[PDB]
Every structure is written in C-alpha cells, then in structure tokens.
C-alpha cells in the first residue's frame, strides 16, 4: 500500500505514531507532525518546525540527519520508520558530508572506527586532510583552473573550410559562419562577437572548447567533419562558469620463530587430521624452507601449542617479509585437502617488527590449477567475517626489551655503499635476451647493469637475495641512484613480484609523467594492483588520489572502479577508505555520483521485478508493467536528469518510457532510452546478474588499440563503446545507435542494407568504413584470442562501420584462434565483385599495418595483462594466458618473420573463407 506507520520522537520525550505516505517528502511529513503534535502533551515548549531536523537510522546502520527535506521518505530508506527531532547545531557541513559518504560508498564510516585499528585511523586522517586541502586550493584558483579540473579537453589522438553554428547563453537566435579548421578556438570566439572571458560549450553536453589547440583536434569537431554535420556551440561567460563552481634490527642473529597456538571454527572431515604449513616470502619468492605442525585430530577448535622455527635470522628478514600459513587436512599417515590460508606481514605499517598474539581470520582455499602449498600472493588483510570464519591464533615472541624497527633509509645506505670484458659480453648476451648461473653474474655485475642497462632493473631486483640484509642493502643503494625509466618499464615494476616499497616508489615516480589521457588508458590496471599492496597508506594510492583530485573525469572512473568492488571482502576496507577520501576532495562530483547511484538503485529494483515477472507471464505485458513501475513519481525523478555514468559529460535527460524495454536473456537486461535537449537520443543497457568485467577489459583493449593506431595516422573507424561495472554483477553498457546485428540484417543482403542506408554517392563511404573497421576488428580479435564470434555478436552501423559486441571469452578460451575472414565481408570489401584485387589488397594492407603497430607496443599489452591477473578473471589467471599474447603477436620473432607468418595465416584464412560458406 501507499502509507506507512512512522514513530516520531519529540525532544520533550513525547512519542507519536501515525501513517504517512511513503512518497511524501520530509517537509510535508514535518507539517503533518506539527499538526498532530499540537494535540499531544507539551506542545507549547517546542520551537518552530524549522528549528529542528529529523534524524533516522539508515540502511548502513548510522544515524543521519536529514538536512534535505525535499527528499521522499522512500528514498531516505530508514532502517525502521523512526524519525527523531533534534536541534540543528554543530557543523552541519561535516555531518552532512559524512552521512553522504556512507551511503555513496555503500559502507558506513562507523565500520572503520569499529575496527579500532591505528593503521586505518592514520590513513583517514592523513588522506582526508590531503584531499580536503586540495579541494580548498581548487576553490581559490580562478575559473580556467575550474574548467580544466572539471571538463578536461577531449582531444583526438593528435585545411578544408568549416561552417559552425554559434549562439550565446539564453538567446534563441544563432550565428552560422565558415571558419578556420586550423585556428585556435579563441579566434572562433573573437569572431563570434562581431573574447578571453569566454569558452565554448558543445550544445547539450558538458564538453568545452578552449586552450592552445586547433579546432579539428577536438573529438566533437572531428566527428562533425567526418559525419558532415554542422557544429552547434554556445558561448558562455566566465561568471556563468564561476556560477557552477560556486553552486638495532641488524644485531639480532637469533632465528625467526613463531608459536602456533590454536585454531577455531574449523569445518573439516572428522576422520582426517589437521596440519598447518607456514612459510616466509618476499613477493612470490620463499625466504627460507617451509616448516609444518604435527598432525592433530580434526576438531572445530584444534590445539597445537608448538614452536615453529625457520631457517633465517631476524636480522635478515626484509621489510616486506610476509608469513604465510595454510591449514590442511591430511588422511592420517599410515589428495590433501587445503582448508584455508592466511598471510601476515612481520613488520607493521610504521616499520616496527611485530610482537605478541595475533588472531588470523583465514580465507578458504579454492582448488586451482597450480595447487601450491601456500598462497603468498594473497592479501594480508584478515577475513572480515570475524564472527564465522576459521582462525589461527599465533604468537610472535619478544626479541629485545625495546621495540625494533626495520632500519631507516640512512642506515640502509650506510651499509649499502661498496671489470672483465668476457663478463661484459655474457651479461649483454643475457639482457639482449633466469637461471641459477646467470643470477650470480648479474649480481656480481650489478653496477654495470645500472650504468649500461637501466631498463633491466626488474631482472636485477629478482636476482637479489631478499633473505640477506647485506644484499638487500646493496640493491637498494643502486636503486636510489637508478635513473628514471619509461612508463612502460614502470608498469612492469608495479607487479606482485616487486613487493619492496622503494621499488613501488621508484615506479610511481616514473608514472608521474603520464598525461591524463594516457593514465586513463591504464586506470583499471592500476586499480587492480592495489590488491597486491600490504599497507593502506601507499604511494600508488596517493598517486591515484592526486590525479583524481586534479582531473574530475579520472576521479569519476576511479570512483566507479573502486565502488564496483565494495562487495568483495578482501578489498571493501581498502577501497572504502580510498573512496571516503576521494569524496572529501570532490564534493561537487559527489552530487553527480549521488544522482547516479539512485538512478542505478532504481534500475536494480526495476530489473529484479522484470526477471520475477517474466517467469510469471509473457513479454508484451511485462513490458507494459515495467513502464507503469517507471512512471511512478519516485522512479521517474531518480531515472531522469542525471549525468551518464559511462561519460559524465553526456546528459541523460528525459527517459523515453515507451522506448524502454529489455533483452530476453536469463538476467533480463534493460534497454533504457533517453532524450536530452542537445544525435538527440542516448541509450544504456543496465545489467544485473551478468558479469561485465570481461566485456569491460576487452573493450578497454580495443580502445587502446584504436589510440595506438590513430597515433600513427591509421584510423580504423573502431567503435569502442562504454562498459562500466558499478556493483555486484551490475553495470552499464553504452548503446550504439543506428546499428543492427548481422543476423537481423541477413534474416547481397549485407550489401543491400548498406545501399539502402547510403543511397547513391555515399555508398563508397560506407564500404570504405566497413573495410577499415573490418581490418581493425579482424586483427583485434586475432591478437586477443577472441572466438565465439558470430552474426548475433557482430553489428554494423549505418555509416558502414562494423563492430563487435558482448565479448565473453579471450586468449583462446572455450586451441589457438586462427585469424578469421568471412566471405560475406570480403564480398562487401570487394564491392559486390568476385575479384577486386585493388580493393582487397588495400584491406590486406590495413590488416598488416594494424598488426604491425600492435607488435611495436607488445610489451605494453603484456604488462597491462600481467597487472590484470590481480582481477581474478577466470580467463586471465596464469602465465600461459600472457603466453597466448606473446605468441599471437609473435614477439619472439623478427618483425619481418612476424609479418611473413601473419601473411600465411592471412592467406589460409582467405582459403578457409570459401569452405565455411559452402
């Protein structure tokens, strides 16, 4: 029904209870309250209604003061329908922001206090203050700054005449005139007056045109030229932009030891017996051999109480040393079940060697292809289901009567400091392109590696003996004068094999030269690498927050990559703290994100209804029921007039309800059409229950391929549309309009569809668009190992651009995937002819140049995929997955040899093309 009975608690102690409409806003409900309270005792002592604010307990279990009384009760979503009147006072701004953060990140702030963890409390105090300071600096910088922060330039990776329609803010009349295709935007403005206090807005979008670049370097312009469309712009005065802004350790030769006390809440087969295995690691290398418990009988609460002694001294343990346990069940010595596992840093976040008891809430082991003893790669965070998870109770003993700290940098360089030609040729050999024998040589000639082969830092770091504080001190000495490496090399160094914080820091130092455009190509991988960190305050976090704070589009996508994993226990805490801090630095964007979260939350409920209905009854009706649900006051408002999450410069204005529908697959994805006051029409797919991460990654790589291509004058007319995970098996996909699937178009049929969409002298354009894009997607899918490619998941735009959708599967998985040519596409490429070798040769050319460009950036793909392994996609688990790409790009081969093998596979694919069709 409509109404709900709400408890009201008045500040006199008086309690009333009555029905209110679920839809009524708090302001209305406050009137109804006053009107009923005059007939209850002690009315006369109340101040007026405006002197008080309602408080509730919200879904995240925090008390929230409801400052915005235009909000409907059903949106407030109180835990129980209990509203309390309290005074206004006492920094309402902190209170409001604090309450909004909790709702936005899905996680109550109080859950961080609850941990009683100084590492957490330190993170929030430093980072929130940094983020707030940046925000305050930004307000005090002028309007240009604000524009750059908020709407950074959208530029093509990079003289005919050009006519453009310009207008001024708040005026029907408009000014069409030809202009300099290569004259800086200022000159468009200076002209339109017939200057420096304006920018140009792209009509009906938050894209702005400014800066020292020329007009056809802008996406909008560049798309207009190609389409033939007349740009449509609005001049906007400075003020109207201000109006948006404004509204010791090395003396401990005793060996490392632990006390294994007890386990709790173990759930194992009572016939079997239980063993704990423990090892020491630095990254993925063992520091010494492993040591094991005795068998004890299986029980819920098993008890060992044994010393486990390792073969390394306390003085040798490196900073990032990591103690790793695994609880195993064995069939009593007369398939071992790996139960669960847990890792523990031995030094704390402030550098102190840990002492005392620890309770490790363990994670369950998953039987995987490697089947390693232990899981040294896993997180050092304890399982947060502390109430029901299995745990180990252990005791780090005392070592000295004072605390001990890993030594300070000064003392590391104190210790750290202090020619053959046959040796200078063996090394060059090894690095022009490890095993026991070569590791000793490289360690010996480490000074040469620094002088002559700076790019081989990664190799030298792996040869170094992280179980020997002398070696470690020496390696770090060189590391500190190591010259700066290119972005590419830095990306390698952010992998799990390089756990040392000096390394991480040297890497980030090399990533600081990234432009915002380039960083954005890698943003997702950089996020995943956070899973490899040990401590909460790290340089990569600080770098990501820096760049989020300087550029709003980066902060937007950082927020969604972090928010989309807040349901994953092993990262909820880390991502949650980053999100808090990001929010406190971006209060404007917060308002955009808040709007997006409520649109999305409504799509979830709207989607859960449509799955549930679809079981009950058939589609035409469920369709109409979806529509009624949508037009409800509160659905409609929440779904209308937001910025798109796929692209925050796109406005989703009015939902076109009669065009809204859904797909027929098992989770019933929603197709939601919009219209804004600009194109003119935008669509999104809302998915809930499908996983979108495989699609996202693939689409991100296709995009990166397009950039690298375009950066060499090769524009292959690709369609790398948005995909954005936003939650637990939830996210959005950009609808490509004026496009249709091959299967639909087929049931010279492809060639006729094109003819009808491009009559007469625009057919040659269509065909050439198809040719370029057919090459790009042919090469893309081949390089990435994408099979399962059929007429349902290949589409075509009315322009003629062909493109692939709904990716699924890559790197060979459910078997190398041959290069593939389809006869029906060869036909169109050949213009409806049997033999058109002029055309067909050009196409092969495009194919070959594209493959050739990607080989030159092959290590870039390999590094990027290496970091994505952190994501735990089933399809990108292991080293062989990375091996698929090395082979697909023939990186073990000369370029000439690479192109020759490509050519062969190209021709075989041409032969194969006829045999499938028959």
């Amino acid at each position: 029904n409509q109404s709900v009975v709400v408890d009201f608690l008045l500040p006199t102690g008086v309690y009333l209870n009555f029905p209110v409409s679920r839809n009524a806003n708090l302001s209305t409900i406050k009137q109804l309250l006053w009107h009923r309270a005059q007939y209850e005792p002690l009315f006369h002592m109340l101040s007026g209604p405006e002197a008080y604010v309602f408080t509730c307990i919200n879904q995240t279990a925090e008390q929230q003061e409801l400052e915005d009384e235009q909000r409907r009760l059903c949106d407030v979503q109180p835990f129980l329908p209990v509203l309390r009147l309290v005074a206004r006072e006492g920094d309402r701004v902190k209170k409001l922001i604090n309450s909004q953060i909790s709702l936005l990140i899905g996680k109550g702030l109080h859950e961080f206090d609850s941990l009683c963890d100084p590492e957490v409390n330190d993170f929030r105090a430093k980072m929130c203050q940094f983020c707030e300071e940046a925000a305050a600096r930004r307000q005090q910088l002028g309007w240009e700054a604000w524009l750059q922060y908020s709407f950074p330039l959208q530029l093509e990776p990079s003289n005919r005449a050009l006519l453009v329609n310009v207008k001024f803010e708040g005026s029907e009349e408009s000014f069409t005139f030809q202009v300099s295709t290569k004259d800086v935007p200022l000159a468009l403005m200076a002209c339109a007056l017939r200057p420096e206090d304006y920018t140009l807005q792209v009509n009906g979008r938050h894209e702005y045109l400014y800066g020292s670049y020329p007009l056809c370097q802008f996406q909008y312009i560049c798309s207009c030229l190609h389409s033939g469309l007349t740009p449509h712009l609005t001049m906007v005065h400075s003020s109207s932009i201000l109006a948006m802004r404004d509204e010791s350790l090395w003396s401990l030769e005793q060996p490392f030891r632990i006390e294994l006390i007890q386990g709790s809440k173990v759930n194992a087969d009572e016939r079997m017996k239980l063993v704990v295995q423990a090892g020491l690691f630095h990254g993925n290398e063992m520091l010494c051999k492993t040591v094991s418990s005795s068998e004890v009988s299986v029980c819920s609460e098993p008890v060992w109480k044994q010393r486990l002694e390792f073969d390394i001294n306390i003085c040798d343990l490196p900073r990032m040393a990591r103690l790793c346990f695994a609880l195993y069940a064995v069939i009593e010595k007369a398939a071992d079940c790996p139960i669960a596992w847990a890792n523990l840093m031995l030094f704390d976040y402030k550098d102190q060697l840990k002492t005392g008891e620890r309770c490790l809430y363990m994670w369950p082991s998953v039987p995987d292809e490697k089947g390693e003893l232990l899981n040294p790669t896993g997180t050092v965070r304890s399982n947060p289901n502390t109430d029901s998870a299995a745990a180990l109770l252990i005791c780090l003993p005392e070592v000295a009567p004072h605390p001990v700290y890993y030594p300070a940098l000064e003392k590391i360089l104190e210790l750290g400091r202090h020619v053959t030609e046959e040796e200078q040729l063996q090394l060059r050999e090894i690095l022009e392109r490890l095993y026991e024998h070569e590791k000793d040589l490289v360690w010996k000639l480490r000074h040469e590696v620094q002088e002559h082969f700076p790019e081989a830092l990664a190799r030298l770091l792996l040869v170094t003996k992280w179980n020997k504080h002398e070696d470690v001190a020496q390696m770090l000495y060189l590391l500190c004068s190591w010259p700066e490496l290119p972005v590419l090399s830095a990306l390698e160094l952010l992998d799990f094999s390089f756990p040392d914080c000096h390394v991480g820091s040297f890497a980030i130092k090399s990533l600081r030269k990234l432009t915002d455009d380039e960083l954005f190509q890698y943003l997702l991988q950089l996020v995943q690498v956070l899973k490899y960190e040990s401590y909460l305050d790290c340089e990569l976090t600080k770098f990501l927050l820096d760049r989020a704070l300087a550029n709003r589009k980066i902060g937007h996508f950082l927020f969604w990559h972090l928010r989309s994993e807040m349901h994953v226990p092993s990262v909820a805490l880390r991502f949650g703290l980053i999100l808090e801090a990001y929010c406190r630095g971006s209060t404007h964007h917060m308002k955009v994100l808040m709007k997006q979260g409520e649109a999305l939350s409504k799509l979830k409920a709207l989607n859960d209804f449509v799955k549930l209905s679809s079981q009950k009854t058939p589609k035409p009706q469920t369709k109409e029921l979806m529509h009624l649900c949508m037009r409800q006051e509160a659905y409609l408002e929440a779904l209308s007039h937001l910025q798109s999450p796929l692209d925050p410069s796109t406005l989703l204005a009015e939902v076109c309800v009669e065009q809204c529908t859904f797909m027929d697959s098992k989770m019933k994805p929603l197709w939601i059409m919009y219209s804004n006051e600009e194109g003119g029409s935008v669509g999104i797919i809302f998915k809930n229950g499908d996983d979108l991460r495989q699609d996202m990654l693939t689409l991100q790589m296709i995009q990166l391929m397009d950039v690298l291509w375009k950066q060499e004058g090769l524009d292959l007319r690709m369609t790398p549309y948005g995909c954005l995970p936003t939650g637990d098996r939830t996210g959005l996909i950009e609808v490509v309009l004026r496009s249709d699937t091959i299967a639909n178009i087929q049931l010279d049929a492809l060639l006729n569809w094109l003819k009808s969409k491009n009559p007469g002298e625009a057919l040659d354009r269509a065909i050439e668009e198809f040719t370029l894009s057919c090459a790009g997607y042919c090469v893309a899918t081949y390089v990435l190992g994408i099979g399962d490619r059929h007429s349902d998941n290949i589409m075509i735009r009315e322009s003629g651009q062909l493109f692939h959708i709904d990716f699924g599967h890559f790197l060979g998985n459910f078997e190398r995937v041959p290069f593939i040519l389809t006869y029906d596409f060869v036909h169109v490429i050949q213009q409806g002819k049997t033999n058109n070798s002029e055309k067909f040769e050009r196409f092969r050319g495009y194919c070959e140049r594209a493959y050739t460009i990607l080989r030159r950036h092959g290590l870039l793909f390999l590094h990027l995929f290496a970091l994505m392994r952190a994501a735990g996609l089933p399809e990108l688990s292991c080293s062989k997955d990375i091996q698929y790409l090395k082979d697909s790009l023939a990186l073990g081969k000369t370029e000439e040899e690479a192109l020759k093998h490509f050519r062969v596979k190209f021709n075989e694919a041409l032969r194969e093309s006829w045999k499938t069709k028959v």
Partner: protein, 161 residues
C-alpha cells in the same frame, strides 16, 4: 600398463567426473559467497536495531529528566489530567521498545541458523576438495601417458568430454 583406446576411454570417464565435481564445487562456492554476503547484511541490520533501540533509550532518559518539572508544576495546579497524558504517552514509548526488541531477537535467531549453514557449506566444500584435486590429477596423468605414447591432439580432444 594398458592399451591406448582403453586408456583414452578412462580419460573420458575421469574427465567427465572431473567436470561434474568441478561444477558441484562451483555450486557450493556460490552458496558460500551469497551466504557470506547475507550474514554480513544481517550483522549490519543487527547493528541498526541496536542503534534504533539506543535512540529509544535516550528518548526515555529525556522523558524522565524533562517531564519531572511538568508533573510537579501540574500537581499544584490540579492538572492530574495533563500528568496522566504525559505518563500514558510515556507508557506508549515503552511498549514500542519491546516490539523493536522482539524484532531484534528474531533477526539474531535467523543469523544464528545461517551462521551454522555457512559452516556446513564450508564443511561440504572441504569434503569435496580431495576428490576434486584427485580427479584433476588422475586426468592429467592419463593425458600425459597418452601424449608420451604419441596420441595426436584430435583423439585427445574427442575424449576430453
């Protein structure tokens, strides 16, 4: 130890058994994940009950402090009527707390039954893993034995499912 077609057939059997136990494991791990997410939701809900109840108890404390004056200021002025109204209003606040408390307890009972479900799942996951692991390995050894025998990839592909 055997002949090739006999080894190949048993490879198909062991592979089939591997895919099936693998699917069953996946079923459980999914219940594990979901049940974990639900338990945490209930735990946070229990916290919300607690914060709500806390709020009611401040209201009670407020009522006893604040009312005092107004009960003795109404006694002199003959308004045992106004006093009665305050106290019945108060009595109504109290009965509502008992309801909220009763709901808190229903939840904790549900969280209890579900904590136990979580442990039975983890126990069942743990009784399966040995077979899972053993099946993967046995399968892999049969593949190995066949590869060394020089059996072509086409044959190994038929047998694998």
């Amino acid at each position: 130890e055997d002949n090739i077609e006999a080894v190949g057939k048993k490879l198909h059997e062991y592979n089939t058994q591997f895919q099936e136990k693998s699917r069953e494991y996946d079923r459980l791990y999914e219940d594990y994940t979901r049940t974990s997410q639900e338990i945490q939701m209930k735990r946070t809900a229990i916290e919300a009950f607690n914060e709500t109840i806390k709020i009611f108890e401040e209201q009670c404390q407020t009522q006893e402090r604040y009312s005092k004056e107004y009960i003795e200021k109404f006694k002199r002025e003959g308004n045992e009527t106004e006093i009665q109204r305050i106290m019945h209003n108060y009595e109504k606040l109290k009965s509502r707390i008992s309801e909220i408390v009763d709901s808190r307890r229903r939840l904790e009972e549900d969280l209890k039954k579900q904590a136990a479900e979580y442990r039975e799942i983890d126990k069942r996951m743990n009784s399966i893993k040995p077979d899972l692991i053993q099946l993967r390995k046995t399968r892999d050894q049969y593949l190995m034995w066949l590869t060394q025998k020089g059996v072509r990839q086409k044959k190994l592909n038929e047998w694998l499912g």
